[PDB]
Subunit: 307 residues, 5 copies
């Protein structure tokens, strides 16, 4: 095979779309292999700029195509340089821009700890014809800085693995596995905006929903609970545009569920308190000891749910 | 005709847009036919990368164009390889990315069970000049995994059928039918998010709407019903952006209809209870036996509507 | 002139955007004219696939360009075949995809009855150099089926007319008129979703707004009317994203107007009832005979407005 | 210089985006200059269709590039004809489609009276090498018709002016000014939809906010004012998506401001009426003469604000 | 190296997207270097228009590619002129259009004072082979005018710095640093729209929330506070689409936080006032001296928070 050395530079990571679970990564790729010795004008290496490499490719120069596996849509490439040394090595430098995708598990939404994965693999040549020697990822632009609400932490993990493509074994009998480079960049979500915009207001809504039992008569406490459940419905919409549709529940969706449960349990308890009287003579105070028991049970529920 | 063998590899299915009834499928296509024996440099097969196939096509090589019938917009193709063996066969490998469309029947919205259809057909050569022998679809990347809220179940159904184009019979007298490959991938929607975000909150709203009859006087129960119907209007908006405009009613839209019906039937019954008095002396308890009859009728309605 | 025969095939009509008054039409166009006899390899006709027609065009073959007049944006063309018979005729087959536009009058919104218009006209050759003989439109894919909320009814109307371009008369003295093909496909909007999502809920809101006069005192009936007008404001937003900005009023906007009018007329009547007392001794029942007169006038208004 | 005559045809103006202050204009451009006499096949003029003009341009034909100065993004050109007469003149006909921009002053929003400006200027040749003789704009398609909510009024104003580019004076010593064509199309916004959707409902909200002073006690009138200010907040959102962010106030934003001012002045006046009692014995009627004075002052404010 | 002189002209800055922290800059770039003397037809300089420069580039002319570092997506270039003087200098004039990005710090949101940064750097040639001599930025189109809600103030700051690329040092031993031009355009946000749309309405909401303590009994003041907190929730949504997700709090988000704090502190104080009675005989006036103390503390909080 041909020993190909890659040096991926990351310019910036931007536009991390949580709803679509995609992100956009800019930067440069510098692939370098070796070939036969060639003659250049002077001792200096030749610079082959874009839209003119095609004359060299139609001349017979071996320029492989390196594609991104996990990309979404066509990667919007820009300028490209094919720098030709006369000692033998050929260097293909290109700028890439594309939307990449990952799994992006969302069990803990505001306190999330994710990673951004770049995958590179030759489109046509397998590991018997093109082998990746090593990659050095230069993430010095975003090594210790925060993009949007994501704090990039650590360096970039590099890994070279041989992926196997069973769909291509009908045209290649034995050699049908490809050398893939994986680049992993960790990212920790900053939870401050969610903490002061969704979590603590909903805690205040929960305390206000607890405040129904301090009232004195029945219609006023029903209207109190109903106008509280209306503003609980108000926060049901706000979370519909910050995280996608998930089979599980996150922290904020569990808080919405707890708000609905607290308010409707209060309404049912108030109804059962009102219809407690068989002949309309009994006072209703024995079941209304939930001024100091219902918040305690709610705190126990929250403490269990945190762990 | 020419016997063409296709091997479609599916990389990932993403972005299933329910409102537009489209979805995006990435992957590779490997078409393979046979031709005259040719000579290559060495015994090894020749690899013809992208943007250089045109020299071979202008030289006179037969490379058919395979289009997607059910695609929406232009399929955003990427890299392509035209691998030439010297024993005779020509292999056209290409990467595709495009938005596909299907019927996507939506009778049961959250408990839906749909399929994703890929259709492939030659654009110009009919079955008398190009015949699809067989297709093996390698859906091993998403064989037993869940994309977004869709759990992909089973393998990919393959079928080769001869479709007939009557619009082209004016230029082709007898042979005007084309061989189309259909690839069917089943998908079952995960109903959990809808279950805890729309169905059970609306059930709590229904019980709260039932709670009007436990009040004691008239103006308070009217205001109770009105502030309940306001939060029923609140959920009328939330469902407007999760499923498209349909002639029929789904489960959630039927629940909205049942909420409106319950609240307005309660308001009309309360009004008729108030105006039951001919001279203002009669008590109103005979018509207010719906504390234990109106929910029973609603449960009967729901049980009939489920089946 | 040259007699050109067109056979437009319609694959699917999708994405009818009411707010933008555009729609997207896929399918194929098959133009066919006649020319000098030519020699082909063998007796079989020659197939000229895409991205290779340019060699024949630079060789000197007459391939006219047929553009779409009413299209929005560039029509996203795909594959194209230039099928050359040796008996003389040249057949240009191409696939088109583009957003088309029409007037789309919206007097009756949910019970609308619209049409989809495709217009085709040569870009450069007038009727003295290129004449459309006839068109057969093969709308067999959507002849008797419903797209989105639009039921396609009937076949496709064909018409050939000579349009006149006065802007081009400075460069062409007498012959400056072009032969345009118009294809009309009727479509009837399915009114069910609007009927059970906007019309009947707003009727229930109207009846609830009528229900104010059954109350007994003043502050409660004002708060009743105010919390009803709030949920009338709630439906003012929902209709803002289903139909564009229009100088006139549709059915649903007239229902919103009637809701505002009913509620504010009720508020003004209640205020005038309260201030009817010169010295605070008069009872207010003479002006509150609108329990059986205000709905009757509203029904008369609606019956007049329907016709 | 070379005398160039332009004849701009306007097909349709669509998609006037008020928030972005852009609009889309379709149509054709017909540029015509004169040159050396040439020989054509026969006496007829030659038609040079698109994607084949490049052979004539590489042959040495002078085809200038005319760009649009005020365009947003790349103007999506379509088909183009380079019609060559043998008597000497060369005619460049092209179809354009692009998003144009203007200042679009918005002092009176619903009763606006705007214009749509098209600017054309050669990219490379100044007025010493290419001079625009005259332009005739053929706006006969939209001369007396209304697009969206904009009624196009009058014809199209034509003007040829020499614009000066000081950035290019380092490479051109004296001749660095360019001949620009400006095309002005007036448009009057139809105010009906805003009149019956925002202006008159907000007037009803204003009258309902005036209705607080007719109540009898304090808590009910506070809750009345609060539930009115809630639906004033409801219309604060609806206007956020119909006009962009502006330093000044339009008519509708002034109505929102007047609604907030009326309601909060009523609340402050009610509070000062309640705390008017030094010992709780005084009646509060002297300050509540605003049943017939507060609307009069509001009418004076509105009459001053209109002029 | 080669001395390259740049003269950037700015046509217009538009579409400053605060949520994405990007902006769009149109205009022209005029690069100019020197080379060997050449012969042109006549004494006049040669004009090389677009899509024909490639013949000169394949002939062997040195045209460097200048890229934008901070751009988002591919910069949508338009027309380009390569003006060749016979005295030796080569002038590359091109039009650019692209979305640029900056840090855009948002500590004070409505009273913001930002800058727009354009960065230009050769893609392939380092400072040993191409050196930027000087840049004159001609921002005369927007020198003293306001774009959208941004008032452009001052001229454009020019700076030439040598940036160092450590990722490219594996292919270049010592010379691996590039000359970058930075263009800084200051912009001050106009705070008027935010001042009369968010700041002063929320101040009125704060005063209305203070108004709870003037009521007389308990259930009415709870419902007062609850229906005030509902319209505080109403403004929590409106600010979600004008500024992005930030770790810190701006002015308006601090006002929302202060509104929630004031209302829930009032609710807690009212609850503690109600449960102040050990046996139900004590009057509650000592803790309700916050009619003249709670606003004073709130004013102290606001005065501290401003500085
Ligand atoms: Na309320
Ligand atoms: Na509300
Ligand atoms: Na919304």
């Amino acid at each position: 095979p041909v020993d190909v050395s890659v040096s991926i530079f990351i310019n910036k990571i931007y536009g991390v779309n949580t709803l679509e679970q995609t992100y956009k990564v800019d930067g440069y790729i510098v692939a370098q292999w070796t070939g036969k010795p060639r003659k250049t004008p002077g001792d200096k290496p030749l610079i082959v700029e874009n839209t003119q490499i095609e004359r060299w490719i139609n001349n017979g120069l071996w320029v492989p195509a390196l594609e991104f596996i996990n990309v979404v849509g066509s990667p919007d490439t820009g300028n490209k340089r094919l720098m030709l040394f006369p000692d033998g090595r050929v260097i293909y430098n290109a700028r890439f821009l594309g939307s990449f995708s990952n799994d992006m598990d969302f069990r803990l939404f505001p306190f999330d700890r994710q990673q951004f994965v770049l995958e590179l693999e030759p489109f046509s040549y397998n590991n018997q014809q093109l082998r990746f020697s090593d990659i050095q990822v230069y993430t010095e632009n975003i090594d210790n800085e925060e993009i949007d609400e994501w704090w990039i932490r650590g360096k970039a993990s590099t890994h070279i693995s041989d992926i196997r493509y069973d769909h291509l074994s009908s045209v290649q009998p034995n050699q049908n596995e490809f050398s893939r480079i994986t680049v992993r960049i960790d990212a920790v979500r900053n939870p401050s905006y969610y903490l002061w915009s969704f979590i603590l207001p909903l805690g205040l809504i929960i305390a206000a929903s607890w405040s129904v039992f301090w009232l004195e008569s029945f219609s006023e406490r029903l209207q109190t609970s109903f106008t509280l459940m209306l503003t609980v419905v108000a926060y049901a919409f706000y979370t519909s545009n910050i995280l996608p549709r998930l089979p599980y529940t996150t922290v904020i969706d569990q808080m919405i569920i707890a708000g609905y449960g607290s308010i409707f349990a209060a309404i049912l308890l108030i109804i059962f308190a009102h219809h407690r009287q068989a002949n309309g003579v009994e006072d209703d105070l024995l079941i209304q000891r939930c001024r100091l028991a219902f918040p305690l049970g709610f705190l126990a529920i929250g403490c269990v749910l945190v762990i």
